[PDB]
Enzyme design. Sequence first.
Site, PDB file in Angstrom:
ATOM      1  N   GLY A 101       9.204   3.147   6.550  1.00 24.61           N
ATOM      2  CA  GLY A 101       9.246   1.731   6.197  1.00 24.61           C
ATOM      3  C   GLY A 101       8.274   1.364   5.094  1.00 24.61           C
ATOM      4  CE  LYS A 142       3.816   4.373   9.594  1.00 27.47           C
ATOM      5  NZ  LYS A 142       3.208   5.723   9.783  1.00 27.47           N
ATOM      6  CB  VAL A 160       1.587   0.677   4.524  1.00 24.76           C
ATOM      7  CG1 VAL A 160       0.190   0.279   4.994  1.00 24.76           C
ATOM      8  CG2 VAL A 160       2.118   1.846   5.350  1.00 24.76           C
ATOM      9  CG  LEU A 163      -1.995  -1.109   1.295  1.00 27.91           C
ATOM     10  CD1 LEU A 163      -2.707  -1.077   2.631  1.00 27.91           C
ATOM     11  CD2 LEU A 163      -2.995  -1.044   0.129  1.00 27.91           C
ATOM     12  N   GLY A 164       2.127   1.148   0.437  1.00 28.11           N
ATOM     13  CA  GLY A 164       3.067   2.261   0.511  1.00 28.11           C
ATOM     14  C   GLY A 164       4.497   1.876   0.841  1.00 28.11           C
ATOM     15  N   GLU A 165       5.440   2.790   0.510  1.00 25.57           N
ATOM     16  CA  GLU A 165       6.885   2.681   0.729  1.00 25.57           C
ATOM     17  C   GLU A 165       7.390   3.928   1.463  1.00 25.57           C
ATOM     18  CG  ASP A 168       2.918  15.860   6.715  1.00 29.81           C
ATOM     19  OD1 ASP A 168       3.027  16.933   6.067  1.00 29.81           O
ATOM     20  OD2 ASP A 168       3.457  14.777   6.348  1.00 29.81           O
TER      21      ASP A 168
END
Length: 266
Positions: free
Chosen positions: A16, A33, A18, A13-15, A116
């Site tokens: 640590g 995560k 997810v 899901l994402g780039e 953020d």
Amino acid sequence: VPFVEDWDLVQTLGEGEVQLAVNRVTEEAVAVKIVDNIKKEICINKMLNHENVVKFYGHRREGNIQYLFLEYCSGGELFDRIEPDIGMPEPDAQRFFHQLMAGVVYLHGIGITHRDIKPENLLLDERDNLKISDFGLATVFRYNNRERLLNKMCGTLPYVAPELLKRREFHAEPVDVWSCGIVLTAMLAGELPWDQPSDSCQEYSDWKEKKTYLNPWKKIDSAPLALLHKILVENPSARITIPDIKKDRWYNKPLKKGAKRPRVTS
Ligand SMILES: COC(=O)Cc1ccc2c(c1)NC(=O)c1ccc(-c3cncn3C)cc1N2
């Protein structure tokens, strides 16, 4: 019940990193995560319980690697609902902005600042409900009813309030209100108004000179633009607060029909 504690990692899901995790027995989808600031993220996440905030289910520490089990939002990022240089329909943006305000009111009410807020950190569930994501930069600004002024510079330059770049200390809540105004701008115009809110930035100078005949402001209707005029105020003490955003005319303008419920005729 055996194997109910077993989860399979099916996609990144994402780039640590997810990963999307699926339960071996129940097929429940959760986001994991994987982190090799982390102690504070788990601590802040343990305080959170709100329908517009990504839910924390728990965590596991397998050696030095921390696993954070989070609510899976199948609709992805709000970022990918924004058409570049166009934005999205005004009623959709209004509904997303309502949900963003409810989440931010909640966080501020328990003394937490996200720090953020941007469309990459606003996730959507299966019913397009907005959820505030990633508390890795978040901090406690109110404790034992005493406000703590912030001095740490963080966030993302196009979304940061001008006081973070100009002042040594600043109040936490007007910083989050400002980034919500940049999010609203991005949803309505599909572009960010400036690289950073500084006098050296020409786009920011034009805004303070009320040159709204230029982009992105020219693409935005006068009712949401009047709200942006109250949010994107340089002086954080003169900037509109969330209780007053909730009384704004565009915020309370009926624009959007509810979910398209199934219906038949005759
Ligand atoms: C259009 O794309 C899709 O439909 C699939 C998709 C893509 C990115 C994310 C998600 C779903 N959902 C998450 O819950 C998710 C969960 C956590 C994170 C995440 C990213 N950085 C920090 N965190 C906590 C990102 C996520 N985004």
